[PDB]
Design a protein around this ligand. Structure first.
Ligand SMILES: Nc1nc2c(ncn2[C@@H]2O[C@H](COC(=O)NCCc3ccccc3)[C@@H](O)[C@H]2O)c(=O)[nH]1
Lengths: 115, 112
C-alpha cells in the first residue's frame, strides 16, 4: 500500500483519522495528537522515506516542499509571532515514527536549546 | 540588511567551515547546544523561512540533504535534530535562513 504501514502511511490513505490542514499530491499537513505547543502540526511526504538520513539526492524538492507547505500552513493558522520547525533523526534525535516528518510548533515562546 | 552570516559567507570573519558548494555553506555554531552543533545556510539571503518563495523549494531541500550528509561525515550515527526557527516565538537569532543540526547527545522533547 502506498505510503507504508506506519501510522503516517495509514493517515495518508485515510485509514486512520487525522485533523488535516492541507493536502496536495506530494505531502499532507495535519495536527499532532500530542501537541507540545498551542499549535503543533506535522508535514509529511506521501512518498514513504523512513528517515532523513536515507533521503535521496533527488528528494531535495520534496523535502523543501515540506518546509514551504509548513510555513504556508503556519501563516494560515495565524502564527504571526513565529514558530519552530523540527526534523528528528533516529534515536538521539527523538524519532519515534519512521516516516519522514516536519514538526511545526508555535503559539508560545519556544526556548533554547531546542531539546 | 546584512547579517553576521553574510560576513561568514563572504569570508570576512572566521568560522569553522564543514562544507561549501555554490549555493550553501555549513559551519559549526559558535554557541553550540550539543557536542555537535552546526548550521547549514543558503548563500542567497532569504531573511526567514516565512518569506521563502516557491522557487526556493529545492534550495531549502538542498540545505537538509547537505545537513544530513555533513551529520554522517561528523559521525552522528545515533541520530540528530534539524531545526529552523522563525520569528520571535521561534527564537530566530539571525535574520538569514539557517538550518540547525544538533547531535552527539540525547535530544529531548519538547524541542524547546
Ligand atoms: N495526528 C497524529 N499524530 C501522531 C499519531 N501518532 C503519533 N503522532 C505524532 O507523531 C510525532 C512523531 O514524532 C517523533 O517521532 N518524535 C517526537 C517525540 C515523540 C515520540 C513519541 C511520541 C510523541 C512524541 C509525535 O509528535 C506524535 O504525537 C497519530 O495517530 N495521529
Amino acid at each position: 500500500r502506498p505510503g507504508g504501514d506506519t501510522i503516517f502511511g495509514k493517515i495518508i490513505r485515510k485509514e486512520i483519522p487525522a485533523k488535516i490542514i492541507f493536502e496536495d499530491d506530494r505531502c499532507l499537513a495535519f495536527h499532532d495528537i500530542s501537541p507540545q505547543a498551542p499549535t503543533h502540526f506535522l508535514v509529511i511526504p506521501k512518498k514513504h522515506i523512513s528517515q532523513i538520513s536515507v533521503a535521496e539526492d533527488d528528494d531535495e524538492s520534496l523535502l523543501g516542499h515540506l518546509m514551504i507547505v509548513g510555513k504556508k500552513c503556519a501563516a494560515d493558522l495565524g502564527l504571526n509571532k513565529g514558530y519552530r520547525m523540527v526534523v528528528n533523526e533516529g534515536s538521539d534525535g527523538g524519532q519515534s515514527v519512521y516516516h519522514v516528518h516536519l514538526h511545526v510548533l508555535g503559539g508560545r515562546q519556544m526556548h533554547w536549546p531546542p531539546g
